A paper describes a structure:
In this study, we report a detailed characterization of Φ[name], an icosahedral temperate [name] phage with an inner lipid membrane, isolated earlier from a strain of Flavobacterium (previously Cytophaga). The virion structure determined by cryogenic electron microscopy reveals similarities to members of the viral kingdom Bamfordvirae that currently consists solely of dsDNA viruses with a major capsid protein composed of two upright β-sandwiches. The minimalistic structure of Φ[name] suggests that this phage serves as a model for the last common ancestor between [name] and dsDNA viruses in the Bamfordvirae. Both Φ[name] and the related phage FLiP infect Flavobacterium species found in several environments, suggesting that these types of viruses have a global distribution and a shared evolutionary origin.
Numbering used by the authors:
A (entry chain D), B (entry chain E), C (entry chain F), D (entry chain H): 1 to 239
Amino acid sequence: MKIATITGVTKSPELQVTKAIGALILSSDVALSALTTEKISIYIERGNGSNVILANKVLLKDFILASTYGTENTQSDADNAMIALCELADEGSIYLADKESIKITLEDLISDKRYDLHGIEEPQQTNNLFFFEQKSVASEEFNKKIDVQGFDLAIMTVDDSVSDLSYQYSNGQVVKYLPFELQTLSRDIDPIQAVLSDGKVVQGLTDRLTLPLVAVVGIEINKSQGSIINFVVRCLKTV
Amino acid sequence: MKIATITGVTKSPELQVTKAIGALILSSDVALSALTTEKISIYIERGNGSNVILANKVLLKDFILASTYGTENTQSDADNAMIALCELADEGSIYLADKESIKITLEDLISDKRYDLHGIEEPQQTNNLFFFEQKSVASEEFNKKIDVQGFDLAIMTVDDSVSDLSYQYSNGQVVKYLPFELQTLSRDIDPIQAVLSDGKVVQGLTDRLTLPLVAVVGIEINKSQGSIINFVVRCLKTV
Amino acid sequence: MKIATITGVTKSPELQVTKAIGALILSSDVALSALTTEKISIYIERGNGSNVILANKVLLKDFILASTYGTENTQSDADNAMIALCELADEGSIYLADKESIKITLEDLISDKRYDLHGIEEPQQTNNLFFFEQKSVASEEFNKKIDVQGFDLAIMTVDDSVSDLSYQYSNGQVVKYLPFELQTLSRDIDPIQAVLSDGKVVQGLTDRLTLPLVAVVGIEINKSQGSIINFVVRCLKTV
Amino acid sequence: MKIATITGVTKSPELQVTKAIGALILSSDVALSALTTEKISIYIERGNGSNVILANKVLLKDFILASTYGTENTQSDADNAMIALCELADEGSIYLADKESIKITLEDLISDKRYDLHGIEEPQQTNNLFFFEQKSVASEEFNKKIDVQGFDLAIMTVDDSVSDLSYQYSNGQVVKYLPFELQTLSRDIDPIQAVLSDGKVVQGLTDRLTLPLVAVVGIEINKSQGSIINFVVRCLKTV
């Protein structure tokens, strides 16, 4: 069902959903490439316990790209320049116990734009949920190793100062990759990334890269100074 | 083989095919979005028993859309502005006895256009066939229940007077959607509906909506008064 | 890794690859429709006797079209006008026994265009390899039968003289197709052949057609005199 | 044997050595104290397997200082202003197996300068090799503790922010040193670090310090905010 419509304000109010949903539809008149600083934060609140945080100030571009990788792609309309569907659980929907609800907030919005939220319910309830985490490589340092065991998808910020990537697999084999090779490998699973309103397609953003991780237990990044690199990693687990 | 080429008239001659075909190819110089009133009628004239009716004046837009849902789409050559492949059977082709035939006819054409029919033969024979049925919702009706048990695909005429549509599943849950929600959810299965000659792609017609029915046993329509809603449903069965 | 950057010459030198690779990346500033006479030759050199010939002076267009059939398609970029990923083995990379290495070369290049090779490494090794063969039908004859058993993919040249293409399957059934029917049927599996730089798509090349051979043991060509018809077939086998 | 000469370019091509060498001779017309940002990278390559990295983008000053500590020192001549010999194995040459080779590259050079590489081989072969690693202390942190167990040498960045540095020995005792005390103890073992072309000698550099770690299992560095501090450590292990 329709959740909220935000316009004319920089910060969206705390939105509460008491109905068990399975996915969220984000629709806005801002094109996906034009999104700059919008952030989202979704979690599950319990009456007599600690909250369960699924996302925490995740960038809208990273959230959309992580949630729409595969056969699907973000679409458009005559009135909305961006429509995306992002699922919060595998197969079924989220099971809500007593005194349990869902809370969604939006931050860093543009004054003269529009945003909408829609909730998508399912005929089933499941215990598996999606979590989003962030890993940063600082600008001052040169190389860094980050452990991505248990994750199945990552989003890299694309920059020209990054030179080398290293993948360590489960069987201990280490493979060397370049940004060009990584982009070409990424575009062999989901060729088209988005469809524009006028009819043209875009096969990938110029500042984000979607890395599918299978049997990967580590990522080493070799770069130079002057820029900060960010990874948005997605995982599935039972709460 | 080439069945017919029709131009200059408003009604097709009663065409007959004796060879066992499994699929039809409809080609025309009229774009997919420019089809208005053309209709098709297909039926197999059996010799031992009753005849088989596969399509009874089905509108050409819905006939094309109900067959090209999934990995495929309707294409366009440099000469023909619309080419579509529509299957009449499952896997193999239609099994025909010594003197049986398949009779096809077209109605409500345009005198300054051209329509071309092709038939595809297949190595195997089968008895399973696809049936296209038509359902209607009256102008004075408020809410209506339709049993879609056994079907797997429907096409509805998009109208502004339709408020809600509710899916009833096999296990007994009822989920109420919206037109926008249904469009978004259906666009994630076949993100591309057609490809134009100039290279632009179209992700969906603005006046038809395709609904895939998986484990769905009921459809409830809630709308206002003053319009007739049209559904074209496809089913697979053995005759 | 980086293999070669050929620019300013009409013939690339012999290139040796010592470590195991499983895929090549061909990149250039000429689009898929701008490749005319470029040829590629890949083989495996054994130190003490005999070589394994995978591809010998195969046209670059046919090599690219025989590898990117299916979900994938040839990519573009803001700098590279064509990128194509062609796998040289199934699943893993090519296993190398004692004292052998891969060797690649190019012929018939345009002296004012840029070509680049990249290699892809994998964490697995395999024995299966992809072999490419070429078949021809002369210009002074009318009909001819060719035997394609064991090949899973073929590429034929498209000419106006081709009238009928008869298939012969493993159960003995014979089906006669037309060029239009073949073109329509081949686009039901891969509807998009390439994605252009500006955001448009192309569903196929004008002079080349791709035929997937499943349960097919023979082909017959009925054509008029005037043009030589060329086939490039791909097979998978162990070495 | 001679490997390569570099002049004009800021980056060296990936240099391959197939003959088993045991030491590298680096020659340049810029004095040892004049090196600013030149980097070196060396690794052993297996044709079908994983590479064995010995040094990955190590500063040339640190590479030279970590190998010429003791009785030896970097020398010079009328033509070459800096000649340094760096050993890559324990007491023989690298034993290359069936398909291994050696790859060396140089990065971030100066356009108007000259660099020369030479290789030294000897009748003995061995498996023990020298590995180079790098450790860092952030520019915002006060007190840091690092582990140096198993390493036999370190090159630290001399900065005026350093106040205290305490060793921890294998018997449990902790001794605190100042920069002046550390420099004096370092020059107590190796008094002369280089001999200039004209005839003067230099005892050590103004920004790098060499620490021999004998029976030391931990280091604690106590400083103030302002800058990053780099350690380059070296170890010997069997491949």
